Design an enzyme around this catalytic site. Structure first.
Site, PDB file in Angstrom:
ATOM      1  N   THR A   1       0.870  -1.212   0.000  1.00  0.00           N
ATOM      2  CA  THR A   1       0.000   0.000   0.000  1.00  0.00           C
ATOM      3  C   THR A   1       0.890   1.240   0.000  1.00  0.00           C
ATOM      4  O   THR A   1       2.014   1.201   0.505  1.00  0.00           O
ATOM      5  CB  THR A   1      -0.902   0.020   1.260  1.00  0.00           C
ATOM      6  OG1 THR A   1      -1.687  -1.178   1.299  1.00  0.00           O
ATOM      7  CG2 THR A   1      -1.830   1.230   1.249  1.00  0.00           C
ATOM      8  N   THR A  19      -3.325   0.414  -3.560  1.00  0.00           N
ATOM      9  CA  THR A  19      -2.498  -0.739  -3.256  1.00  0.00           C
ATOM     10  C   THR A  19      -2.780  -2.007  -4.072  1.00  0.00           C
ATOM     11  O   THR A  19      -3.738  -2.088  -4.839  1.00  0.00           O
ATOM     12  CB  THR A  19      -2.717  -1.085  -1.760  1.00  0.00           C
ATOM     13  OG1 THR A  19      -1.894  -2.187  -1.366  1.00  0.00           O
ATOM     14  CG2 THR A  19      -4.182  -1.457  -1.531  1.00  0.00           C
ATOM     15  N   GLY A  94      -2.008  -1.185   6.495  1.00  0.00           N
ATOM     16  CA  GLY A  94      -3.148  -2.037   6.772  1.00  0.00           C
ATOM     17  C   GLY A  94      -3.903  -1.552   7.993  1.00  0.00           C
ATOM     18  O   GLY A  94      -4.278  -0.384   8.091  1.00  0.00           O
TER      19      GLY A  94
END
Lengths: 190, 359
Positions: A1, A19, A94
């Protein structure tokens, strides 16, 4: 990402986070297109109560389904001050994206840190499950002992995130900062 | 809230300063592509799409054409909107597709097999934004990336290290991938030149024929074939049915500042607003950065938010998300009252909150 921010001379702003999910995604290129394919399907709850690669869990809401968009934690964010765009930020990580962006906002508003100071400051995180207060290097040994005394399960771990931010002065001056956690990154203007 | 600080000569860390335009990204080359675009007269959206395409070439780790993401746009006039270009699960996707014969999730299938891929939305997302909020034609914002792909660029420390660390786990396991990122049996090293001829062709075709090239053109064909020949699910119908979606941003107010972030399918916006709502009840300034108390309060607040995330968040087009209750200041206040500045509550004693009284 990865996340990036942009602000032009007219005052327009954009924050983008996109991402393939994990680094290089599946690592699979689609034929002779040269395009790498994402492994975003792991962001779905594979089975109720079972954590994914990021430790996140779900049930029916985030269950795999045809044409369904898997839940994401990506948070391109823009803060407004005195009616004007003031902070443009975001970050990869994340599950930790939420707390990383949160800290950028708190550092800016509550602690009055300039965008570079806010960016270079150490980060901590807690995502309910697992039950641990994850921290980066940088916090006082004294401070950390108190947290554990309070009952926190402090866990010193890997650096978190890669903020790429821009703060906008009311006069139009632009202030930017690239995360030191990412080698070869850059914030530049004119 | 205390006074803000844009930075002074005495600080330890100094922000980069500019009077006209600015770009912040994980990659020097991509950032410079963005700056050149602004200098050439493009607006933030134009530069943003150029950066996005550039990163798809120079930062294969995450920059992409085969992935997805989100975009937050705020016009000089105050109009704030969100662009959802998150991947869509294939039409043939099934609830238990990642469970083995014993009913247990197989991470290998959801992370390294052709089944792990969702239908890509990045190209659609960038075009939706460029068309409605940009000022430059797609071909112009794609050109910088095209040249980087065709003529190549020097592998730096970040890329070399990532190829070695993360790339080694998946790239050499696929012939076409290995042919691009591996050299003489090893991952490309710092100083080497990475040329991506195939990616340049894809980029050239997108710049020439528009987004349809990816979703209905030669690229769509290449993706569908890669799937069909290797146990994947993405079909031409899936790609043809993909759509980026403009959504209303999730937002809140924190001590007089308005915060705008991504709404579902993202969980980010909601929980950032929720946590800020919780923290608003405390004099954070007073405790200060790095203070045991400030960290205690934020750690606890976070627990309650992630608890709710696991329960109420999902694709809004399939499930109804109680975003109003989750971002309700009364609800946040109830959570704040549960926060003990001297004792942390185990995640075992924390469950998704009851939102009924706030809906």
């Amino acid at each position: 990402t990865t996340h990036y921010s942009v602000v032009d001379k007219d005052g327009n702003a954009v924050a983008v986070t996109y991402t393939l999910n994990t680094t290089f995604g599946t690592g699979i290129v689609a034929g002779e297109s040269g395009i790498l394919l994402n492994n975003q399907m792991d962001d779905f709850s594979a089975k109720p109560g079972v954590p994914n690669v990021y430790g996140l869990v779900g049930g029916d809401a985030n269950a795999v389904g045809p044409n369904k968009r898997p839940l994401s934690s990506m948070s391109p964010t823009i803060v407004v001050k005195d009616g004007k765009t003031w902070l443009v930020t975001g970050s990869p990580g994340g599950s930790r994206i939420i707390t990383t962006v949160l800290q950028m906002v708190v550092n800016s508003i509550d602690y009055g840190l300039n965008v570079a100071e806010a960016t270079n400051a150490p980060r901590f995180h807690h995502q309910w499950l697992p039950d641990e207060l994850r921290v980066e290097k940088g916090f006082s040994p004294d401070t950390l002992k108190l947290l554990e005394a309070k009952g926190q399960k402090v866990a010193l771990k890997e650096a978190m995130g890669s903020t790429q931010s821009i703060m906008v002065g009311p006069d139009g001056e632009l202030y930017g900062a690239s995360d030191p956690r990412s080698v070869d990154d850059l914030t530049a203007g004119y | 809230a205390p006074p803000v600080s844009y930075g002074v000569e005495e600080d330890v860390f100094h922000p980069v300063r500019a009077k006209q335009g600015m770009v912040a990204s994980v990659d020097a080359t991509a950032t410079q592509v963005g700056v050149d675009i602004l200098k050439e007269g493009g607006n933030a959206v134009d530069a943003a799409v150029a950066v996005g395409y550039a990163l798809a070439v120079t930062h294969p780790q995450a920059g992409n054409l085969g992935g997805g993401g989100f975009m937050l746009i705020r016009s000089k006039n105050g109009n704030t909107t969100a662009i959802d270009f998150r991947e869509m699960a294939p039409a043939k996707a099934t609830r238990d597709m990642f469970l083995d014969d014993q009913g247990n999730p197989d991470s290998k299938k959801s992370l390294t097999s052709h089944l792990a891929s969702g239908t890509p939305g990045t190209v659609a997302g960038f075009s939706l934004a460029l068309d409605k909020y940009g000022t430059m034609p797609l071909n112009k914002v794609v050109q910088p990336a095209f040249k980087l792909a065709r003529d190549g660029f020097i592998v730096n420390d970040a890329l070399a290290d990532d190829l070695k660390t993360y790339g080694s786990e998946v790239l050499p396991n696929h012939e076409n991938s290995k042919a691009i990122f591996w050299k003489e049996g090893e991952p490309l090293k710092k100083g080497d030149t990475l040329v991506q001829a195939n990616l340049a062709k894809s980029l050239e075709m997108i710049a020439e024929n528009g987004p349809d090239e990816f979703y209905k053109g030669t690229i769509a064909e290449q993706i569908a074939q890669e799937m069909q020949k290797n146990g994947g699910l993405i079909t031409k119908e899936d790609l043809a049915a993909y759509k980026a979606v403009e959504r209303t941003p999730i937002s809140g107010d924190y001590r007089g500042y308005q915060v705008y972030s991504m709404p579902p399918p993202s969980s980010g916006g909601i929980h950032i607003v929720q946590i800020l709502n919780i923290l608003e009840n405390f004099d954070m300034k007073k405790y200060g950065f790095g203070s045991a108390d400030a960290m205690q309060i934020m750690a606890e607040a976070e627990k309650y938010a992630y608890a709710d995330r696991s329960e109420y968040l999902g694709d809004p087009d399939f499930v109804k998300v109680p975003w109003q209750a989750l971002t309700n200041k009364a609800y946040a206040k109830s959570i704040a009252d549960q926060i003990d500045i001297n004792k942390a509550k185990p995640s075992s004693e924390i469950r998704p909150g009851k939102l009924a009284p706030y809906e």
